[PDB]
């Protein structure tokens, strides 16, 4: 559908809040985590992105559960059975109700619905790969129990199925369809259930902070534990001998707990956002002092009990809130710089690892409204310049050490910092204040250097040409400024029709683009201080735009949900993409390959692939709502007989000259009468105004090879009539040589003189 | 034997074997070119050029006779062409140890090039241009 960009991948995604699940690959483990309509598979020990799924679902992922290689995901009424991120099978419930949870034991598939109905699937053979055969359908009447909480299976219960309600526990015999057990009515609503490493115990977390160690054989309590004001979300068992228990709250606070000395030991504090719902799932691995934590805050953290409190071991995460401003950091498309509204600062990689690093800020800092970056002096001092909302000083940052700068930048007019900019050489800091002052700092020694003041409203954008000679600016008062940077001289300015909201400069073509309030993109030459173009068409506010690296294209995006591309030499909008969610920012990579978009909903950063293989297009708008080879080849340092006789009948030597010009250097073929028709062929060769450079070579080679039979010992046979036919037209072609003597000698004279 | 290995801060044990093979080639060249009639200008001219190029290589820094070719060409002579021994005897560092300690970590310069090898060799005419960085 699109004619430039193609939807490639999203980066920066770790979790979303759906419960992750643990899988076994031989002796090691992997983690299955959800993002949206796409899931990710990580290492359990060293945390590498091992798989991303190949194809998005129609709807959001609800339940995730896995076996030895088989990742099972849920949506509307379809169970997706995948291996290595690739679908083996799609197995659908025979209904339209939404699937809630999954439990996979033995050879069956247990599918919960939202209408309190459960479907049961089977294999054929006990050595088959997955269940696909229908077995039966059970229901949960509300007179037997309320809404289904979750599905589990306790081991050595042959064909029994554990279905817990919000009030009581229903134990089934699925081969027969019976209800073999029902538990009595409990006081509090249950939200959490979890198996045990011993028989017949199932754990129950209530809506309040009560832990119930329930027995399945007798049906009675063994132990309950009250925690004041805690909503239990997750249970699991550290079965490394150290018989413990963790209890999750909705607050993001996590209770690591001792079960036999009966000890409250630890609590993790806003490791996951209470705003995003707190700790969504916490699980011990089997047999190692390891617990894994994930919440709704887009981060997994490994906490391990170093043999006693646990410890932050290693983790991966990202911006919990969607981003505000990004930038490309390298000329090799590797690291991107990203800032969001939840006040963190992350530098991501782009490559196959999807390792990334949060920056070092050393209660968070205020969010960034204006960013600028140079990669000319990396490693030596700071080269990233950031503003903040409602502040008066712009901080600096190192790209090398991933650590914050050492300089604060003053407006010296008591305004807010509205725009930042750097030169190409990386020596200078340009800062424009909301009261209209443009001040200029050193980037090396952090000192005040120079001050300009011409605008009388908020200076909304500063840039500088790559030669560091001419300094451009823009105000809200419709004024565009043009300065010498070498002097403080006041070269020239322009009056326009509207306030200017954004400015992005292109350095290797010396142009710049301005977004006005009349919803039009103006393109202005930088050299001659002249407006050259004005482009109309966006029905709403222009948000972000960027030049393509070769300077031919401009891609903008707006609140009409359009992303348009604009060819500068033709003045015409060449393609729009009409999307379903409006992206906050867009930037080209410095290489001509990648287009970066940042959106309002969801945290990831979508990446688009520039095609760049071909096109010859200019189509339009509104739609849906060699010459050395022969001449060196002749000097030798170390049938066809139908056509020439059919040319003995008429003038058919064009096909013959075509088989001369086609291939096969024919120095042996012209030596295997006929010579007269050969010369008449050649006079038809000179008759057209083409290919004389091969023809002269044919003529001269003819006088190299057959030059005695041409001579006939004592000439003037009918041969010489054909030579006479060649002579006069060869006198016609004599003209070209003297022109070559003219240009060679005159060019030699202007070379000398 | 290992007296030489310990006197001149040799980083290896192989280097005594290598310089032993080179000096063996020089001695057998000397013996084979020696056993000629002594008025044959082949012998005089080639032993003469061998003398002059062994002047330039700094091994025979001593101005020599013919019979020195059997006598003085040892391993320790070419080992005294190694860089830090030139450095010490040019009175820059204080011991050979500390000279090797300086060349291990980059402060020494022959000509316009940085050196970090303790087995670079100097001529009798390149050692004028040794300084620091």
């Amino acid at each position: 559908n699109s004619k430039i960009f193609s939807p490639f991948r999203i980066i920066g995604n770790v979790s979303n809040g759906v419960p992750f699940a643990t899988g076994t690959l031989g002796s090691t483990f992997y983690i299955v985590t959800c993002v949206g309509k796409t899931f990710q598979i990580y290492d359990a020990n060293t945390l590498h992105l091992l798989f991303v799924s190949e194809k998005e679902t129609p709807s959001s992922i609800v339940a995730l559960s896995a076996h030895f290689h088989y990742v099972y995901a849920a949506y509307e009424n379809k169970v997706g059975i995948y291996k290595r991120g690739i679908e083996e099978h799609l197995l659908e419930l025979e209904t339209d109700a939404n699937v809630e949870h999954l439990c996979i034991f033995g050879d069956y598939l247990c599918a919960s619905t939202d209408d309190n109905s459960i479907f049961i699937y089977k294999k054929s053979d006990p050595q088959d790969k997955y269940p696909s055969e229908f077995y039966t359908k059970l229901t949960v009447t509300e007179i037997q129990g309320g809404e289904i909480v979750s599905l589990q299976h306790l081991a050595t219960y042959l064909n029994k199925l554990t279905v817990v309600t919000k009030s009581n526990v229903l134990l089934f015999n699925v081969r027969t369809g019976k209800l073999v057990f029902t538990s009595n009515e409990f006081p509090d609503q249950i939200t959490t259930a979890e198996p045990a490493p011993v028989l017949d115990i199932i754990a129950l977390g209530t809506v309040t902070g009560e832990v119930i160690m329930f027995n399945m054989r007798k049906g009675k309590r063994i132990r309950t534990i009250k925690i004041p004001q805690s909503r239990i979300s997750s249970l699991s068992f550290r079965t490394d001998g150290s018989s413990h228990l963790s209890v999750g709250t909705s607050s993001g606070d996590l209770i690591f707990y001792d079960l036999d000395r009966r000890s409250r030991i630890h609590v993790l504090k806003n490791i996951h956002r209470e705003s995003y719902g707190g700790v969504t799932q916490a699980t011990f691995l089997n047999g190692q002092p390891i617990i894994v934590t994930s919440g709704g805050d887009n981060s997994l953290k490994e906490y391990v009990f170093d043999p006693q409190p646990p410890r932050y071991l290693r983790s991966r995460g990202g911006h919990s809130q969607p981003p505000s401003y990004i930038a490309f950091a390298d000329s090799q498309s590797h690291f991107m710089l990203s800032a969001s509204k939840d006040r963190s600062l992350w530098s991501f990689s782009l490559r196959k690892d999807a390792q990334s690093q949060e920056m070092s800020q050393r209660s968070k800092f205020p969010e960034i409204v204006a960013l600028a970056i140079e990669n000319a002096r990396i490693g030596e001092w700071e080269n990233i310049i950031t503003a903040h909302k409602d502040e008066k000083f712009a901080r600096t940052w190192d790209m090398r050490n991933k650590r914050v700068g050492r300089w604060t930048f003053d407006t010296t007019d008591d305004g807010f910092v509205k725009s930042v900019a750097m030169s190409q050489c990386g020596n200078f800091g340009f800062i424009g204040s909301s009261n209209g002052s443009i001040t200029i700092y050193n980037m090396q020694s952090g000192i005040l250097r120079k001050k300009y003041k011409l605008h009388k409203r908020a200076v909304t954008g500063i840039s500088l040409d790559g030669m560091n000679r001419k300094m451009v600016s823009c105000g809200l008062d419709g004024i565009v400024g043009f300065y010498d940077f070498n002097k403080s001289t006041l070269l020239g300015k322009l009056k326009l029709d509207a306030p200017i909201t954004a400015m992005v400069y292109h350095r290797s073509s010396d142009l710049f683009a301005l977004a006005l309030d009349d919803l039009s993109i103006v393109v202005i030459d930088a050299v001659t201080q002249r407006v050259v173009r004005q482009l109309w068409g966006h029905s709403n506010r222009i948000t972000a735009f960027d030049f393509s690296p070769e300077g031919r294209w401009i891609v903008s995006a707006s609140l009409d949900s359009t992303i348009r591309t604009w060819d500068l030499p033709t003045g015409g909008c060449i393609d729009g993409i009409i999307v379903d969610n409006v992206a906050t920012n867009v930037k080209f990579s410095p290489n001509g390959d990648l287009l970066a978009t940042t959106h309002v909903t969801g945290n990831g950063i979508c990446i688009w692939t520039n095609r760049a293989q071909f096109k010859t297009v200019s189509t339009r708008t509104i739609d849906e709502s060699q010459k050395k080879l022969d001449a060196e080849e002749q000097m030798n340092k170390f049938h066809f007989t139908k056509q020439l006789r059919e040319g003995s009948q008429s003038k058919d030597y064009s096909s013959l000259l075509a088989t001369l010009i086609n291939f096969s250097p024919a120095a042996v073929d012209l030596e295997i009468d006929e010579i007269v028709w050969f010369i008449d062929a050649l006079t038809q060769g000179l008759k057209s105004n083409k290919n004389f450079e091969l023809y002269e070579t044919f003529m001269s080679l003819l006088f190299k090879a057959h030059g005695d039979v041409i001579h006939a010992n004592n000439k003037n046979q009918d041969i010489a009539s054909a030579l006479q036919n060649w002579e006069d037209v060869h006198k016609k072609e004599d003209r070209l040589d003297d022109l070559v003597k003219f240009c060679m000698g005159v060019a030699a004279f202007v070379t000398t003189a | 034997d290992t007296q030489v290995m310990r006197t001149y801060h040799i980083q290896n044990r192989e280097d005594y074997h290598k310089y032993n093979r080179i000096c063996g080639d020089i001695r057998r060249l000397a013996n084979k070119l020696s056993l000629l009639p002594p008025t044959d200008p082949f012998r005089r001219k080639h032993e003469q050029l061998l003398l002059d190029k062994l002047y330039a290589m700094g091994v025979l820094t001593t101005k020599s006779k013919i019979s020195d070719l059997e006598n003085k060409v040892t391993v320790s002579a070419i080992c005294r062409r190694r860089l830090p021994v030139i450095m010490h005897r040019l009175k820059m560092a204080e011991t050979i140890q500390d000279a090797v300690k300086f060349i291990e970590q980059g402060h020494v310069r022959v000509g316009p090039n940085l050196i970090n090898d303790p087995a670079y060799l100097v001529t009798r005419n390149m050692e004028d241009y040794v300084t620091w960085v």
């Binding site: 490639f8 991303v52 033709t570 002269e696 003529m699 070559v740 | -």
Partner: protein, 755 residues
């Protein structure tokens, strides 16, 4: 100049190890270097794909069945995908282990990699756009073996994989879970180590070769099973069979040796067709064309860096050199030929616009230090560490003279006048400078003026001034052609090694003893000193060159970097070499103003000013449509089509707006062109001329333009110098064609009158 300068060639072909193969077309040679992949076309060698994600310098390479997919594998086990013009389509870390061989199908469905103790086969992706995080899909994998897999062979059914192993045995693999003949039966009995196996293209002869020269023949009888048919025992050949490849003609064998010779055989005859020697250096690998007409074989890195192309009727198609690390470069006065100087003591000429290895000269006793042309185009002077210098003319191939005469073992810098009268050389170890008349080798004088080693020397185009930079913080100026001598200045700073002259006699560029590179005129007004030479993976100043238009200089030290500068202060662009373990040692500037050179230890040149970039010179878009307004000015007003479509710069327009205007209109156009739109069209004709066959057409253009504005380019020099050189090479290379053959029809008519 602002253009995107990037690598799209390299300086000479094979320095490093790898596999080698042709295309299916028979006209495209696939011969890698270690660092990148250089795929030539056989007629008029050019350069097509230039990957660089290789962190390690070895390749394994093959294309599928039409050349739409290329891979390349290094030691680590990551690969990189390109389609036709180096898109770098896909990228894929594939293995933590190394690969031995890669093989496609003739069908493009399956994919073959040998690694470790396993055998991987992959489902091949088609050409598309991107949008796969992991494009490769696993089809099957086969377990197992006893040790490493070293060679691989595919069959025509695309069902039948014949693979050897390192444990002196061979195995067979059915692709589609067929169990073809229900057997994956091993092959044993081999006394010696296995170097390869082949499956014949008639499904009845299964072929194995061992390292000793032995060849074993099995049949398709599966009494019932495998029986041997023809054995051998070689004990007196006494080498090792290094590489082996088999013909698609299915009659012939090719065997490569460590001894340095090339064997040919027949398959069931075992006749000796031919063997050929090329040296003692071992043959690394050999591959045949798909029709048996052309042979090509690669030679190992420590041995020959040479790859020959021998046919079955025994004549060498392409011979070549391309030796090691390089000392010096210089461009010829025609912008097509580039000299190189190698360490082993040769001097080779490279036609790097077309990839030929043209000609050599070998009189050096040791390494070569300096090469430079004279401006006549006749002669070039070489300087050595031989203790002498010598002269050369091009296709007479004959040594004029070898100037020397004082006892000396080292020269280091060689420079001549434009006048061709006198040649000066600077001794690295004498504190004096030498001159020679080229008439005799008489010694005129010995100009005693320095106190340190003299280390860089150059002349002027004014040609009365000698620039003499010695390595004692002292720059000197000399008079040679007057009746006196001169006073010579003092630097402020920092011992110099690199001197570079403006072609005016008015500016001198020096490199100080740090990253500061500095310039001053001939009245010692120091204009700029400029900042350091970055990019460690200490800082230096080795070479520097003044560009020909007089607006730029190029700096190259030994620190993986090369910098651009203008006459004012600013750093323009820094290009650089990425690889892993000096690099740069010499840089000079082309007389075509399209690119320049940088002598690296890898060996890599081009910069290539292109025209794909939108420049807007003189308010391009007030001429709103590049199409319809130009369409109006193809019907009317041909003066205004030039100025309109010339401010525009789509190269896909200039062919038609330049072609379409009539012949009689041309002197009226050239008489009325503006003087500001002149050089870009004079440079456009000088590089458009060499391509097409419109000789009459462009020639009446250059008659009109050179007839039009002769005095204006006479006074406004140094850009039409570059353009004028570009047109003069076209004039001479067409003149020497048509004068030759027009003479060869000028003798004929009077030869008829003879008898």
């Amino acid at each position: 100049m602002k253009s995107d300068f990037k690598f799209s060639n390299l300086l000479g072909t094979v320095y490093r190890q790898g596999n080698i193969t042709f295309s299916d077309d028979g006209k495209q040679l696939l011969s890698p270097v270690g660092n990148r992949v250089s795929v030539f076309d056989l007629i008029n060698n050019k350069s097509f794909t230039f990957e660089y994600e290789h962190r390690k310098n070895i390749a394994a390479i093959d294309l599928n069945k039409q050349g739409t997919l290329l891979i390349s594998i290094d030691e680590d086990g990551r690969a990189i995908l390109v389609n036709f013009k180096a898109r770098n389509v896909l990228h894929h870390f594939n293995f933590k282990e190394k690969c031995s061989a890669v093989k496609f199908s003739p069908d493009g469905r399956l994919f073959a990699l040998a690694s470790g103790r396993f055998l991987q086969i992959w489902k091949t992706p088609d050409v598309n756009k991107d949008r796969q995080f992991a494009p490769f899909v696993r089809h099957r994998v086969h377990a197992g073996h006893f040790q490493d897999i070293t060679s691989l062979t595919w069959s025509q059914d695309s069902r039948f994989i014949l693979t050897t192993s390192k444990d002196l045995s061979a195995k067979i693999w059915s692709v589609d879970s067929e169990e073809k003949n229900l057997a994956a039966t091993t092959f044993n009995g081999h006394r010696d180590y296995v170097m390869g196996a082949f499956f014949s293209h008639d499904q009845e002869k299964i072929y194995t070769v061992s390292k000793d020269g032995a060849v074993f023949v099995w049949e398709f009888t599966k009494k019932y099973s495998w029986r041997i048919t023809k054995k051998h025992f070689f004990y007196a050949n006494q080498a090792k069979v290094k590489c082996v490849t088999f013909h698609p003609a299915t009659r012939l064998l090719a065997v490569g040796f460590t001894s340095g010779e090339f064997r040919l055989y027949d398959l069931p005859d075992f006749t000796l067709i031919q063997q050929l020697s090329m040296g003692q250096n071992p043959v690394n690998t050999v591959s045949v064309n798909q029709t048996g007409e052309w042979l090509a074989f690669g030679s190992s890195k420590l041995g020959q860096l040479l790859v020959y192309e021998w046919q079955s009727e025994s004549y060498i198609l392409k011979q070549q050199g391309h030796f090691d690390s390089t000392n010096s470069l210089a461009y010829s006065p025609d912008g097509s030929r580039v000299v190189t100087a190698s360490e082993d003591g040769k001097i080779k000429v490279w036609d790097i616009t077309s990839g030929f290895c043209l000609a050599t000269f070998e009189e050096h006793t040791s390494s070569v230090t300096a090469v430079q042309f004279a401006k006549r185009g006749q002669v070039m002077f070489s300087s050595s560490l031989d203790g002498t210098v010598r002269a050369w003319d091009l296709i007479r191939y004959r040594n004029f003279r070898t100037f020397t005469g004082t006892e000396r073992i080292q020269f280091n810098c060689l420079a001549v006048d434009p006048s061709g009268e006198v040649v000066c050389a600077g001794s690295l170890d004498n504190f004096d400078i030498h001159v020679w008349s080229v008439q005799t080798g008489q010694l005129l004088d010995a100009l005693s003026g320095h106190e340190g080693p003299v280390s860089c020397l150059s002349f002027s185009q004014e040609n009365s001034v000698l620039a003499s930079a010695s390595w004692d913080k002292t720059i000197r100026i000399w008079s040679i052609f007057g009746r006196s001598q001169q006073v010579e200045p003092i630097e402020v700073y920092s011992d110099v090694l690199a001197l570079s002259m403006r072609p005016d006699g008015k500016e001198v560029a020096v490199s100080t003893l740090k990253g500061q590179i500095s310039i001053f005129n001939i009245e010692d007004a120091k204009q700029v000193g400029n900042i350091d030479c970055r990019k460690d993976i200490s800082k230096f100043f080795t070479t520097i060159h003044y560009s020909f238009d007089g607006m730029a200089i190029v700096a190259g030290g030994n620190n993986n970097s090369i910098c651009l500068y203008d006459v004012p202060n600013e750093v323009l662009l820094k290009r650089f070499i990425v690889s892993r373990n000096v690099r740069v040692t010499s840089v000079q500037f082309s007389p075509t103003a399209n690119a320049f050179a940088a002598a690296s230890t890898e060996g890599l040149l081009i910069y290539s000013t292109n025209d794909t970039i939108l420049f807007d010179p003189f308010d391009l878009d007030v001429d709103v449509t590049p199409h319809s307004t130009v369409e109006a000015l193809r019907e009317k007003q041909f003066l205004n089509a030039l100025v309109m479509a010339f401010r525009l710069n789509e190269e896909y327009l200039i062919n038609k707006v330049y072609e379409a205007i009539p012949i009689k209109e041309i002197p009226l156009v050239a008489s009325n062109i503006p003087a500001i739109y002149l050089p870009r069209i004079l440079k456009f004709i000088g590089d458009f001329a060499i391509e097409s066959q419109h000789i009459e057409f462009n020639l009446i253009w250059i008659k009109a333009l050179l007839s039009a504005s002769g005095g204006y380019i006479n006074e406004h020099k140094y850009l039409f110098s570059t353009a004028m050189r570009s047109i003069q090479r076209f004039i001479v290379r067409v003149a020497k064609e048509v004068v030759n053959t027009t003479t060869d029809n000028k003798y004929t008519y009077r030869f008829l009158v003879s008898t």
